[PDB]
Amino acid sequence: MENFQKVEKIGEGTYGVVYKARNKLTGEVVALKKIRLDTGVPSTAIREISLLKELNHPNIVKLLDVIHTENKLYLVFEFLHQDLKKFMDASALTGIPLPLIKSYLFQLLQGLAFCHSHRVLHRDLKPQNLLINTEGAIKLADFGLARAFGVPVRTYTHEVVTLWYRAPEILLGCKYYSTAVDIWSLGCIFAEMVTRRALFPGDSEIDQLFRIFRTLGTPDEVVWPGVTSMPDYKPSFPKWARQDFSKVVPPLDEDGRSLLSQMLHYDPNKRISAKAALAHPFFQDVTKPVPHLRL
Ligand SMILES: COCCNS(=O)(=O)c1ccc(Nc2nccc(-c3sc(=O)n(C)c3C)n2)cc1
């Protein structure tokens, strides 16, 4: 801090508070995240975070500076003016126009393609972490912070962390999950943009899993070899039949439903990569429209 002048709270992220702040030399407005340290700050968290300062991409919220003092760490991010949650709320009556949904999905997949080529995972994608600007860009925020620490189930703020976007392999207690978890979260967000309702609004871990199962079918060894040996899998899970995607995300067109199906494959190895998603036929007519943002 010290060179920074708080102007308002824009989020109680999972790791700390997030303020809009004005840099008191350069005059730049930034998003300041005070990170809430367990005792001190692990040096490995510091080296983990430092590598992020280099992971720069048009679709990743730029980390400007990391600033360390005793039991407070600060991350200084470029400031964007709105998150996708708020923009989706704002768009609730008419929905986001599909061309703009498509552009946002395409850009994010580009972001994810980049991170994953550097072996960096987000692990916690959600509409609150997807930030937009007036020029039609969308960016991944709060990014690779999960590996740097871990994610508590209860943030310092006593708001519950959302499970709505969590890949099934995480929920079934796999320890060493992959990039494919981010593809899953992004498909849940795609679906939500299209339908204007959360796809799997779980309010505990088993409600979340049983919501996935109801829509997609209870997974078995036919669709997900190895599933039945995962740490939190129980042979006593109820066996639901799969619903059709025509019912899940109307009125998404066939290309979009086919891409979404690949993003939502149970087996993280059959799940489409970000890079392969970019070549899907759904992005043959991609464009970059301007949102109607009300700031
Ligand atoms: C009433 O409005 C409250 C809803 N939040 S909001 O207004 O849409 C919003 C406004 C601005 C921002 N800006 C912003 N810019 C850069 C980074 C961030 C975030 S969001 C997040 O979780 N982190 C860690 C960061 C750095 N936020 C984020 C959210």
Residues 74, 59, single domain; the answer is: yes
- Is 48 annotated as a binding-site member? no
Ligand 1 atom closest to 16 (CA) = 24
The helix/strand/coil state of 277 is helix
**Of 81, 102, 123, which residue constitutes the final position of a domain?**
81
Residue 229 Cα to ligand 1 midpoint, Å, equals 39
Residues 71, 93, single domain; the answer is: no
Residue 59 identity (one-letter amino acid): N
Contacts of 11 (CB under 8 A, 6+ apart): 17, 18, 83, 128
How many domains, in total, are found in the chain? 2
Q: Is the CB of 18 under 6 A from ligand 1?
A: yes
Show the domain range for 137: 82-293
Q: Give the integer Cα–Cα distance in Å for 208 and 211.
A: 5
Q: Report the alpha-carbon angle 18-128-38, nearest 5.
A: 45
**Of 63, 81, 99, which residue constitutes the final position of a domain?**
81
Tell me which residues are annotated as active site: 124
Number of C-alpha atoms within 13 angstroms, CB side, residue 24? Answer: 8
Contact in structure between 167 and 177 (CB atoms under 8 Å) = yes
Q: Is the CB of 139 under 6 A from ligand 1?
A: no
Tokens matching residue 176: 């060493």
- Is 107 annotated as a binding-site member? no
Residue 24 identity (one-letter amino acid): K
Q: What are phi and psi of 227, to 5 degrees?
A: -60, -40
Other CB atoms within a 10 A radius of the CB of residue 167 amount to: 25
Contacts of 188 (CB under 8 A, 6+ apart): 164, 165, 198, 199, 200, 264
Query: What 3 state SS string does 108-169 have?
Result: HHHHHHHHHHCCCCCCCCCHHHEEECCCCCEEECCCCHHHHCCCCCECCCCCECCCCCCCHH
Residues 87, 184, single domain; the answer is: yes
CATH number at residue 43: 3.30.200.20
Q: Give the integer Cα–Cα distance in Å for 249 and 194.
A: 7
Tokens matching residue 139: 């960016």
Residue 188 Cα to ligand 1 midpoint, Å, equals 20
Other CB atoms within a 10 A radius of the CB of residue 270 amount to: 12
Q: Which residues lie across from 72 on neighbouring strands?
A: 36, 69
**Of 20, 55, 81, which residue constitutes the final position of a domain?**
81
Residues 60, 127, single domain; the answer is: no
Residues 87, 74, single domain; the answer is: no
Q: Is the CB of 15 under 6 A from ligand 1?
A: no
Residue 21 identity (one-letter amino acid): A
Residues 201, 211, single domain; the answer is: yes
Q: Which residues lie across from 154 on neighbouring strands?
A: 160
Approach to solving: X-ray
Contact in structure between 88 and 190 (CB atoms under 8 Å) = no
Residues 187, 260, single domain; the answer is: yes
Backbone torsion region of residue 227, taken as left when φ is above 0, otherwise alpha when ψ lies between -120 and 50, otherwise beta: alpha
